[PDB]
Structure formats: structure tokens, C-alpha cells
Amino acid sequence: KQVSWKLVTEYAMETKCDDVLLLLGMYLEFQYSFEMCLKCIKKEQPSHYKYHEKHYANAAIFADSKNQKTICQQAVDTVLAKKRVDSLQLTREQMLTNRFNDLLDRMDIMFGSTGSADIEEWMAGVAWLHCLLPKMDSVVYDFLKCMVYNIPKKRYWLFKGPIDSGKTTLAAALLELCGGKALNVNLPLDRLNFELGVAIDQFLVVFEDVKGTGGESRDLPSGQGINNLDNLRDYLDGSVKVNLEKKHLNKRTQIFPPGIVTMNEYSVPKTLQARFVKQIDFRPKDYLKHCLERSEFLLEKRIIQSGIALLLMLIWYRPVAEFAQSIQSRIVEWKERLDKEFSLSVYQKMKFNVAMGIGVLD
Amino acid sequence: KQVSWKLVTEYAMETKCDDVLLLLGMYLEFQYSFEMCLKCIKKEQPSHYKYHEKHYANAAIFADSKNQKTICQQAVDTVLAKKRVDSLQLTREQMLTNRFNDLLDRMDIMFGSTGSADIEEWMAGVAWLHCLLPKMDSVVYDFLKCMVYNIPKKRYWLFKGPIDSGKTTLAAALLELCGGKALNVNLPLDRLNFELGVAIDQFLVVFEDVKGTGGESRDLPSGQGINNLDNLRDYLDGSVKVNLEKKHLNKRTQIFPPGIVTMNEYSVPKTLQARFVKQIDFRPKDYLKHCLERSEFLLEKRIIQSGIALLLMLIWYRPVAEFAQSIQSRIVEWKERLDKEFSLSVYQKMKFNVAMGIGVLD
Amino acid sequence: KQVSWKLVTEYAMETKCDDVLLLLGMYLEFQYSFEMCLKCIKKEQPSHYKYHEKHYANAAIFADSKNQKTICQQAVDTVLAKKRVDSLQLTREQMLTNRFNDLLDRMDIMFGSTGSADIEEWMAGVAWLHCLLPKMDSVVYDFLKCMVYNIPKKRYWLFKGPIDSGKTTLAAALLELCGGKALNVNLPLDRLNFELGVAIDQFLVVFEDVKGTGGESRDLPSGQGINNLDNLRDYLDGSVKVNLEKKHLNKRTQIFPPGIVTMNEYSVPKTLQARFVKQIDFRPKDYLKHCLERSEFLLEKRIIQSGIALLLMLIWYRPVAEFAQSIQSRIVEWKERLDKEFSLSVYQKMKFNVAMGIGVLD
Amino acid sequence: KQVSWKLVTEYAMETKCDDVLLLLGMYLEFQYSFEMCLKCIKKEQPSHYKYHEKHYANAAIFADSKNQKTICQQAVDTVLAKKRVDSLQLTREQMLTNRFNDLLDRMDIMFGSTGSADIEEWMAGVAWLHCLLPKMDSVVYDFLKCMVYNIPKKRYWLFKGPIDSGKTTLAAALLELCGGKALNVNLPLDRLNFELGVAIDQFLVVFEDVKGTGGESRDLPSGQGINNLDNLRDYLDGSVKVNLEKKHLNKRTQIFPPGIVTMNEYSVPKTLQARFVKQIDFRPKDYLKHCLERSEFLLEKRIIQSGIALLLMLIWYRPVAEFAQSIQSRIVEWKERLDKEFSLSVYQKMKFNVAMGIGVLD
Amino acid sequence: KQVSWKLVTEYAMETKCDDVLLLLGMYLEFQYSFEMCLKCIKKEQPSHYKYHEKHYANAAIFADSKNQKTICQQAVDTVLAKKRVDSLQLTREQMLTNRFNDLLDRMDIMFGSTGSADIEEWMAGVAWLHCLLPKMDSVVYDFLKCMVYNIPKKRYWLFKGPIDSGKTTLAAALLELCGGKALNVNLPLDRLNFELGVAIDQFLVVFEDVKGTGGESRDLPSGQGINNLDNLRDYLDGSVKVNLEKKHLNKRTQIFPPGIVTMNEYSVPKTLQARFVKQIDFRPKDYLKHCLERSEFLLEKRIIQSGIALLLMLIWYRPVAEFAQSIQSRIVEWKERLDKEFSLSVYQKMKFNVAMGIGVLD
DNA sequence: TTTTTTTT
């Protein structure tokens, strides 16, 4: 008897697991009889219940091995390797088409037979989101395409407006949608430059809590951030490759992704002010609060943060042909499901009632 | 014959140990004949006497082996792996339910037949805490709910007041109850980077003693804390994942825990102010001051500053329906024990005594 | 049977792959039968489909190995060794031939078997270059000469002027044609090392804007950039070898390479400019915006940024006799393939579109 | 045959050896034929001469081992592991009892058959110390009880006075008695981060000659100390765990020890002074000076610094009930030896000699 | 056949080598034919020619090994381990006794028939040194015992006098005789910590050329060092341990060693004058200058700097009883040699020449 | 290999 490292690796690939402890912990669960595995019986997690019986025999033999972390290290490296092969070979539009398939597979579960969530609330989110700004689903489709075509030095959108104006609210959902990362500008230039090292393979990025100096005219308590933007204006423009930090591995050089950054109106150089392809003002909108104070399940469940909310909004608005091609198979089968659950009058009722500043329902 | 590595791992699972030297040291103790083991006979540490007989046979072989630290390292990473799996897959509520079972177990010891402390002194403790604030037990129910829901931008509580107001005490009790960590931010901006790394995978965190600036006009010597947290809104808001590191380790990326901030009274900007949900004023009460000086076992056993006392307070005051369904059986047991162990009127009198600043007991 | 480590090492030098993760990922693909490999059938990536059938047998056995990552580390060390050998042995001419020898291959990709592009656009890009003066084609060749004919102080070109002077686009383009790296300055002197240590064992180095003082009459921010330059004699005029410290790290010593410094208009402590090949002063021109306004594709495809344009600038303007002996024949072939598209009247037609910034497809 | 790793571990255990090189060097001393060992015959060093004969056979085989440092590292791990296990599971009273056992063992060796130190000279130092403060022995027992109980916030004593006051003399004695480390707080505010790292697992700490502020009238050098202490009030309070750091070590977390602060007569802010239980002001004493000047053997053998001197004072002054039962057996035997050796007339005469400032002896 | 790791280690012991690379290089040379060895035949280095004969047999096999560097590591560990055992167990008298044995080994070679240097010239050194200060030979013996007895407070010596007054010449010879280190304390206080770090496990220290305030009154360039020393009482007094730091390493705890201080006539605080045992005035003496002009071979061979020069002086001037009993056998032989080598009258003529300012030899 | 250091 000896461990099949191949079967271990196949789980890691099918899981797309890329943490060595996470995989180690995960695989050890399979050593017991799936026949009475309460997790399986509960259909507790798909990462478990889909795989327990398949891997049982190997996991029992793995459970006794003396090499366990070394086994897992090779498996995790194949996953990172696959990511990087894709990362350089694939088209940006092609990448997106794979990301969507990931999210659809989750919705299969979320609203499955184990329909643990329920779509009523999520469409109310779509309504509330589609209340926030004009042509909402368009400007999504617009920024979506912008990030695919990646026109050099047309690469970033920006937002401004008071605290709680919702700009973070928009931003977070866009990031959950695409995948990507968010980072902090304002830390000192050493820590800064290491932090940039997270950008590897990220299709898209954001920065939060960014500061300029001197916003105190707007009463804004102020700080460094703008300085460290200006340091990276080639990253911004993506004009070039640039190097990216690591620990215990070489720093690696490549071109830098596009995206969005959080601001409110501190000072900022005009080489930035004139630079960017887009910006939007977030203005607070009281009737949202007066729905929200009722509809608080939205926040508890992070529905308004969900990228799945955005996808549902696009599935709601746009015609099937407007999406990338192969997904249109599944788009229709979701378009179907929307028709089945929702008449227009459902969403009509929802958004109207909401728009009056009432709680979500009557 | 050979050492079973599996048996060592199982002991680490059973103890939930995760320091290689603690594991190594403790496992070596088993090598003597458990038959005669003085520590067993004294019944001194359950981490030992519940396991010595079981592990004896394998501890003798471990005492010979040339690999000892390697065997221990595997087991510790197994426990850490388990933590990461749990962290990624339990509901916030289940984590707390697990944590509460651990405290109930320690209480079954502390007031078990071994009775290493007096349940009456511990209940005397609870009275002093209940006295400390308006609607104390309702206040605690609020805080647990807040930490469990973890609602975006509604994650932080601010204790403020004068010196010796008890705010640190209350934080330390809440901290132990949920099992957070404590963090300093009156620190240099560079090594600050490694400080926050502690907070990886914690349920809760607390920021101590956040020193303001211009404070010495008010006799409070100015310091970095406020000048520092004002650059960390991303972390507090918990709205998007943020990245964390440790020495010789690459960055994790996760949401930041909810938590508490403590200060003596300092000026706070609208920005940071907007990101706390509740703030609480504490003020000295000379009758409490006197009573501790009589009842000083409250300090010496640190009774007034343990989650055990808060857990007890919740048990006495809250309906069993307010507990998660899984644990409710043990709650009924302990409620019945306590309602049997103490009348209302003893508790009534304790409050009168403590309100009257005399030593607690008569 | 066993993995041939030799075969893996061949593929690294054939593909010139020099990342262990990429190498591992690429190579793992070959374990499926090339016979039916859809990537091969679709002929998407030569780095795949050229090699699959050869490596398939070895790849299957590799995919089974326990030791896979170390096989790849040795293979990547092989390529790193070759590069280090060449970087020491050859002359700047030979090295520059080896570039042009396969910027040639870029032509064979840019106009590769797909009908990869229409060279019209590329010379429209080249034509957009030559616009500060009709001298500029010489200045390319003259700069290239200064690089091979490197003499002390005959090292650094002061590329002087405000935004949108194109200087950075050009610097980036040369950093593709020749290679080299780009760098910053306005630092404390230790951090300036931790910056400049990037330059280890390289042949061409480029730099960005530097703070003088007192220039706020042209709104130029004062600072300590110029202050560091007065200290950098041992590098700037550079007659004698000097060390190349990265922070705490790789303290190489040699002659520091030549290249280009980019900065705005600023005052002149002549102590500095004395060390330079140049003081060449640039400004934007209004009509050039109105060209770009109407020639947008030449930015969109990065044609204007690519060093490829500089090859074809040189292929146009410089007579074949000026090129290195073995490429001259290929220069004829791209003077042929120039004339396979271009009369000088079309070149002039495009110049005279630009003469008032007419859309250059005219 | 083969090296017993177990025997090496036992030697490390019995010598309580912390250090891998010290262990290596020691063990190699045994490789030479036991019966001729001059170190044994000269009875030079019990750490050698007790063990040589037993370990001899394995030491010779160890001398051949190709693996020597690995064996020592494993052995040192078990000694380190023991300390960490004890640190968690011991009562603070038990720790102190163990520390006393070790000092009492050193006192056997000093005054035993080896005749190596003069019990009469040592007793003179107790007389000089019992003069140094009012009620001197009472202060020691209170300090011991203070440090055993470790009451939150009520954890630190402040020593104040001029130069040549004796305060660091007394602090050093209490530190050797208990075990612990001094610390210097006058450092730059970065290196505090590593300076405090020394506190890990200690039983006491001493902050040495904290520099305050102003006070050129006071004729005191200024420094960081006082204000920088206030920035660490948490570590005084000890109410909650803190995070501590050593070079190359990832952080470990503990309650910061109780201890002593020493300073000249600077001003102190009560934000800090609220955290001192008790304050002792020393005075210069002419008769002590003139006594010491004629009692130089006290200093020439460091008697009045040494922890053994304080232990001898407690044995003389304190009833046997004040000691923990385990050592009451040994305490009684030492009391017998002292009352055999001395008389109260003698001790009073010594104290009178100190009071008269003559040499202690007459 | 196998390599003897033992034979390598024995060589490392006897060379007292502690650099892994240096040990490696030396041993590899023995692989060449010992019987023909040119380095042996020319008697170039004793560390080679004494050993090549024995180790050649093993060196041949060493040259084939693949473990070469790890063999050297274990060898060098053995030397370092020996030094640790020594430092923690020898008496300071035994420590000195070893270093004299080492110096006498060197002298045995220098004044040999093939290893050769001029026993006549080196005695001109002692004549010159014995003129630099009255009762020179006794002063050395006094200083020596002072360093050995290391009595608290009685620990430190002050050298005072103008530039070019010989104080550092004499200090250097003492430091060579005793194996200490120099330290410079004119730094600003915060930087001193790594300076003081140098002292770890050293026998002596010399504080070089301390600058005071107010020197400009006498054109002495002024500086901090005086005030820094006044701030270091505990290091000087040497009564109690202090903690010392080296780069990357964690702290060491030890008595700060005894030593020497040198200065021009800066005004010395009364506080410092209490610290020093001994003040020596160094003054320019015009006759020594003219003697040096006429006998520069003293400078050219560095004779007057050498601890070997001082050791010769002690051997000439001090009774055999002054030396430690164990070394006296070598001393008597060296006395016998010098008794043969010089009449007293020839030596006395040299003194008369030195007093005459004439060249030492005639 | 980082970390510590460096410098702050």
C-alpha cells in the first residue's frame, strides 16, 4: 500500500485548492467511512460530499503517511502552475467566460434543492442596486467591457462622495464578481512595494481607504496615499511590465492589471485628475436607508456585497446574445428560471415599493 | 516496532494543542509507567491524567526515536489545518457554539466535584459585573449578536471614559469569552506590519488604549494610536478581504475580525466616528472601589475579568430560547443547578450589599 | 522506467522558458495523448503544439513522479546559467545582433502566418515618431552607437521636458528594442541604493523625474533629487567600477551601464549636466493631440509604445550598410517588405496627414 | 554498537543545559578514559565530575558519530520543551519553591565539605542589608507575596533616590533571588520592540534607571524613559495578554511579568504612577559608606548583590510556616546550621558595627 | 576506503581554526605528494609543514569525498564548542596562562634558525619601552594583576596626555598581550549599543581617544564621549551583570569586562575621577623622538607595538615567581636564553643610548 | 531566505 499522490492531486485540481493547510485538513476528513459521514448525509459541503467516497480508500492510506505535508506541497504547486499557464495563455474575454462558469456552479447550490438562500431577496438587492444610479446595468456592462479591452492608459475608473455614499458598496461587488484583489495605498513605500506583490494573476484590482493630503477644506482628515499612487503611474497606465515582490521566491516581472480606486475629494495631482477614462459621483440617497432599516436581511447576508447580485442584474437586463457565446447555453436556463419565479409584476412591485423608501415588501 | 505517528496526532487533536514544544514536552511525560504516575494520582492536569494510560505504550517508543521534533511538527500542522478548515466552513454561530462548549466544560471542572473554586465566589463575581452598567445582561446579548452577524461597517464598539473605569476589564472579559486577540497600535509604522499578522483567523480582536494627540492639554500624553488607526478603515470596515502576514510566511488574505476599541477620552474625527456602532461611557463608582478592597478575592482570582463570569451571567438572565438550539440541553442543566444552588433573594441581597459598598457577603 | 531529466532540460532551452512554475505547468500538459490533444489540433500555442509529440512519453512518466518540482528547478537553473554566460562573454554589438535576430522573429509574428497584421499601421506609428525634428531617426542610430561606443560621461542622455512630450513612450520603446530597466531617484541615500541595486549585471539603464529646487515659478516642486545626483559621480560619469547594493543584498561590482535620464524642465547646477551625453529639450505640440485624436488605433494596439516601431524606424531610415553584417540581408528583406507596402509618397502622404493631424488612414 | 540519543538527552536534562554548543563541548570532555580524568581528580567542576564515569562509554561512541550536532539539537529541545510545559502548568508558588531549591543546592555546595566560601563573611552582608532599609526582611516577604499573587495592576514597585543609594544593589539581589532580567527603556522607540522581547517566560523584570525629563535643576540627564513607560501602561497593568517578539522569532503571547522600576528623583505622571503599588525612597547613609570602606570583602565577593544573601536573611528572620511545606524540611536544617554557627549576640554586634560604621567584623 | 572525520577534527583542534573555509582550504593542500611538498621544504608555514606528513593519507581520500563542506562544519563546531566550555569554566588566571603559552609558541618559531627574526632588535624595543614611563615593568605587572583580580570598582585605568605621546602605542601592546578589543564611544548615545556589543566574551576593552566638551579652549576637538562615559557607571563599576547585543543575535548577559581609557587633556568630571583606579600622564619626551629617527627599524617591524615585546620585558624584569607556576618551566628556559644572549652591560648601553637620543645600537 | 538592519 502507498498513497496515490495522483488522486490527491486530482482532488486539489477539482477543488482548485491552493492552500497547503486547507488541502491537508480537507483530505484528512475522508479517512472515515463516508457511509456514516454525517457531512455527506447532511450534504454539508460539496467539496466534501462530492468527493468523500471517491477518495476514501486513498485517504485512509494517506492518513497513515509520514510525508503528508510534502505530498500536499506538490499538489498545491500544480494548481498554482495551472493558474499561471492560463494567466499568460488565455484571452481576457476567455478568462471572464471561465470565471462566470465558476459563479454559475455556485448558484446551482445556493438556490438548489438545498435552496439555502432564496431568490426573492436577491432580486430585491438587484432592485436596490438598480435604484442607485442611472442606466445601472449598462454601466456595469460598460466597465465589464472596459476591463476586457484594457485600452492602455484608459485603465481605471474612480469614485468620490461622502462617507456611506455607497462607493465601497459598488466596488466590493464588482470585485466579488470578477475575482481580483483590493489593496491599501497609504502604507510606507517599503511595505507598499511589497503589498503590490499580491497583484499576480489578478484580472483586476482595487484600492481602499486611499488618502490625499489637504482635504481639510472639505474637512477631510488627510494623508499620504496620493504620493504612492504617483510612484506607480506606469502600473496605472500599464505602459510596461514591472517587477512584483515575494518571500522565499523570486520577484516576478509582468504587466500590471486595471481597475478602480476609492477616494473622496482630497488633493490629487492633475496628471491624475485629467487622466482617467471614467469617474462617478456617489450622492447619499435617504429613501435607500428607509428601505434598508427594514430590509436588513440584505446586510446580514451580505447580499448587497455579492457579485452574484450583479450577475443576476445582468441576467435580468441584457439579451442572451449580449453575453459571451458558450455561456449562453446556461444564460437561457437561468433566464428561464427568472421567468418562472418572477413575473414583471413581482419586480415591478418590489422596485416601486422600495423606491418609495418603504421596506422591501407589502 | 515503531512509533505510531497517528497516535501522536490524535493526542494533539484531543488536547487541541498547537505548540510543537508543548506537544513534545507533554508527550514525553507519558513514558513513565502510568501505574505509578504521581501526576495521575494527584489528578492534577486533565491534559495528562485523561490520556497517560492510553498513550503509555507508544510514549515508550517515542522516547527512543531520532525524529522526535518531526513527529511533533506533523501533528501541530494537523491541528492548524483543522483550524483553517473550520474557519472556512463553519457559520459564525457554530464557532461560538463550539467555544461555549469549551467554557461549559471548564465550568464542569471548576465547579465539578473537584470544585477547585467556589461557585458562590464565582456568583459573587457575577453580581459585581452585573452592577457595572445599565442593563448589563441585555448589553451582553447585543454584543454577541453584533459579533456573530459581523455586518459590514457595523462591526466595532468603542469604550471610552476616565482611568480606572473598568473598560479594560470589560474588554478582557468579552475577549476571553469569544476568544479574540489583543492588539497594540501605539507602535512604529513599519513593525506595525508584523503586529497585525497575529489577527489571522481569529474570531475577534481588541485594540487597546488607543492614544490620541494634543491629549496633554488634557493631561493625556499624545501618541500614535489615533494617528495610526485613521489609516486602517479598510480593516475595520471588513467590507473587502485584506491581506495579512507573518515572519517567514507569505500573505494570507481574509476579512478582518470584528472587535472593540478602547480609549481614555480623546477627540475622534467624523471619519473614524462613523465606523463604530455603539460607544459606551464608563464612570467611577466609589462604592465599587471600596467593595473590591474588601472582597479582594475578586481581583486575586481575577474572577471579575473572565468570560466564565459573563457566560454565567448570560445563563442566569437569558431565556434558553436565546441560545443556539444545539447547546440548550446543557443550559437547562446549569440553569437548574444554579437556580437550585442560589435563591433569588441571596442574589437580591448581594446587589444591595454591593450597592451599599460593603464587602459582598453576610 | 524513469523520467529523463535531460529531456525536460532541452525543452527549457528550446522554449527559453525561465520560470519554474510556468515550466512545470507547460510540461504537465503533455501527459495527454498528443494524438488527440485539442490544443495541438487547434494550433493555438507553438510553445505547446511544436513539442507535445516528442515529450509525450517522457511527460507521462514525469506526471507520475514524486520529485517533479526539483526536476524543474534544475532545468530553470540551466537557462539562467546560459544567460549569465552570454551576458559576460559577448560584446554589446553581438548582444544587440542577438536581439535584432529575433525582433526579426517578431516581424515573423507581427506578420505571421495568420496574416498577423497590416504593416501600414506600423509605419503610421513610425511616421508619428519623427516629429520633434527630421533628425530623430539619426538620433536612434546615434543613441545605439553611443551604447556600443560607451565612453565615460558618454553614457547618459538628459531627456528633458514636460508631460506628453513622448519621451517616456520612447524610453519604454527602447527598453523593448534594446532591453534595459527604468528607475527612480527622489530618496534618502540608503533607500536610493535599495532602488538602484536593480541594475545588477546589465547594459542599459533608464530613469524618471528628479526634484530640483526653487522652480515653483514653473510650479516645479523643490526637493532633494538633485542633491542625490551631486553625490552619484561614481555612477554618473562612471569611469571606475562601483558596487550595486540591493538592500542587504547582492553587492555586485562592475562598471554601471549607460542610458537615459527623463525629467521635466528644471534649473541647472552644471556640476551634473557636465556628466552627460546630452541636454536635449522637448515640448509637446498642439496638433499632435489632434493626430492622436484621429489615429487612435496606433495607441490602442500599443504600436506607438512598442520597441518594434524602432526596428522599422531604423529599417526605413538607416541604409542597410549601417546594420550588423549578418542581419543586413534581413534588413534588405524588410526594406523589400517595406516597399511591398510603401512608396515614399505614401510615407509622405501619411506625413502630410500629420502635417495638420488629419486622420492618418487618409 | 550505536549512539544512545536517550543518554545524551538525560545528561542535558540533569545539567538543565540550555545551549547546544555548551552541551556539545561538555559531552566531548567525557570521551577520554574516565579513570585518568584530571578534571574529576581535581574535583574541579561537578557538571563534569559527577557524570563522566557513567556517560563514558556512550561519549566515546559519540565521538565517532557523523551526526553529532543533530543529536545535541534534539537533546536541547527537550530541555527547552520542559521549560515551556512547566511555564504553563505550574503555580507561581511552585515555581518559587523550585527556584529556592536550586539556590539551596548552591548553598550546599558553597558552604559544604569543599570549604569553598566563608559562611561568616556571607552573614556579615545580611547585617549590612538589614540596615539598608527599615524593617528590611518584612519588605522582602511583602515583595515575595506581591509577586506570587500577581494581582492585576497591583503589580509594580517604584524605587526612588539619589545616586549611590543602593537601589540597583537591592534590585539585583531580588532579581537573582527570583530569576528574571533587567531591561533598559531609554532606547529609541523602534528597538523597544526587541528590548521587551526579553520578558518572555520570565518571573520578574526590572526597568533600570529610567530617565525622565526636565530636571537640569535636578541635575538629571534627560531621556526617553518616563514618557516612553507611560506608552506601555498595558504591560504594567498585566490585565490582558500581550504580544512579544525576538529576532527571527514569530510572535508569542503572554501576560507581561510583574517587577520593579528604578529611577532618580524625576517627576512622574500619575497616568503611570497609578500603576505603582508602592514606592520606596532610599537615602544615602554615611555609616554604610564608612562601614563598606572597612568591609571591602563584601564588595570584592559581590556579597551584597547576591541572591544567596537575601535567602540567608529570610531563613534567619522568618518563621518556618511562611515557607511552602516541601522545603520546610530543608529550611529547618539550615536554621539549625545557622544557630549552631552563630549567636544573636554576634549578629547584634555585627549590626552595631554597621551602625558604628566600623568594619563589620569585631 | 572511508574518510576519517576524526583526523580532520584533530587538525582543526590543533590549528585552533574556526573559519570553515580556512579549514577546508588548508586540508585540501595535503592531498599533494607530501614527500615532495615544496611548502614543507621551504618551511613556509608551520600550520602546514608540521601536519602535511600525518594528514596526507587521509587528505587523499578527503579529496574524493562529496561531503567535504559538512565534514568541515562538524570539525569547526568542535573548536567553537571548546571555546564555549573554556569561557564558562576557566579561572581568569588560567585564561591568561593559556594566552602566554600561545605567545611563547610564537616566539619559539620567530627566533628560530629558519623561521627567523632579530632577537637583538626586539630587545632594543624593550629598552625603548622601559624608558617610556618610570618603573615601566612594575606598572605592567600591576595592570596585569588588576585585570586578573577584576575587583568591582577597582577595574579601570586612565591614560592622559597630548597627541603623539605614546598612550595608544602602549595600549596596543597591552591589548595584543591580552586579547581584548578597541571600542569608540564618541557616537551619539543611541548608536552605542552595537559598539558595546563588541565586548562579548572579551578579556579587555580599550576606549579610544575620548573627546570631552570645552576642548576648543585648548583646541582639542570637542565631542560627546566624556558625557557618554559618565552615563555608563554600571559597565565601569562592573559590580552586576549587563545585557549586550550583536547584530542579528539575541542578547547576552555578562559582567562588562575591565579595560583602559585614553584622552587628551579634556577636563574630567569628578564623577569619573572617582571611577578610575590609576591615572598615568603621558608626555612627549624630545630625546625619544631623535632616538626613533636613528633607529626606525623599530617602527618598520612594528616592534614597539608588540605584545611579544612586552612579554620579553616581563621575562627580563620580573622574578620567576611572578608568573603562574605551570608556565615557569618555559620562562626559565627563556631567561637562560636571554642571559646567554646579552650581558647586562650591553643592554645598559642601549638604555644610555636611548637617554642620549642616539641610535639604539652602537 | 528571511530577517535584521538601516535609518529613522
Ligand SMILES: Nc1ncnc2c1ncn2[C@@H]1O[C@H](COP(=O)(O)OP(=O)(O)OP(=O)(O)O)[C@@H](O)[C@H]1O
Ligand atoms: N447612496 C447611499 N445613500 C445612503 N446610504 C448609503 C448609500 N450607499 C451606501 N449607503 C450606506 O453606507 C454604508 C457603507 O457604504 P460604502 O462603504 O459603500 O460607502 P462609501 O461612500 O464608499 O463610504 P466610505 O467613503 O466611508 O468608505 C452601506 O452599508 C449603506 O448602509
Ligand SMILES: Nc1ncnc2c1ncn2[C@@H]1O[C@H](COP(=O)(O)OP(=O)(O)OP(=O)(O)O)[C@@H](O)[C@H]1O
Ligand atoms: N466604577 C468603578 N469605580 C472605581 N474603580 C473602578 C470601577 N470599575 C473598576 N474600578 C477599578 O478600576 C481598576 C482598573 O480597571 P480597568 O483596567 O478596566 O479600567 P480602565 O479604565 O480600562 O483603565 P486604563 O485607563 O488604565 O486602561 C479595576 O481593577 C478596579 O479596581
Ligand SMILES: Nc1ncnc2c1ncn2[C@@H]1O[C@H](COP(=O)(O)OP(=O)(O)OP(=O)(O)O)[C@@H](O)[C@H]1O
Ligand atoms: N509631442 C507630443 N504632443 C502631444 N502628445 C504627445 C506628444 N508626444 C507624446 N504624446 C502623447 O502623450 C501621451 C503621453 O506620452 P508620453 O508618456 O510618452 O510622454 P512624456 O512626455 O514622456 O510624459 P510624462 O513626462 O508625463 O511621463 C501619449 O498618449 C502620447 O501619444
Ligand SMILES: Nc1ncnc2c1ncn2[C@@H]1O[C@H](COP(=O)(O)OP(=O)(O)OP(=O)(O)O)[C@@H](O)[C@H]1O
Ligand atoms: N545607602 C547607601 N549609602 C551609602 N553608600 C551606598 C548606599 N547604597 C549603596 N552605596 C554605595 O554605592 C555603591 C553603588 O550602589 P548602587 O549601585 O545600588 O547605587 P545607586 O545610586 O542606588 O544606583 P542606580 O542609580 O544604578 O540605581 C555601593 O556599592 C556602595 O558602595
Ligand SMILES: Nc1ncnc2c1ncn2[C@@H]1O[C@H](COP(=O)(O)OP(=O)(O)OP(=O)(O)O)[C@@H](O)[C@H]1O
Ligand atoms: N613619549 C613620547 N615622546 C615623544 N614622541 C613620542 C612619544 N610617544 C610616542 N611618540 C611618537 O608619537 C608617535 C605616535 O605615538 P602614539 O600613537 O602612541 O601616540 P598617542 O599620543 O597615544 O596618539 P593618539 O592620541 O593619536 O592615539 C610615535 O610613533 C612616535 O613617533
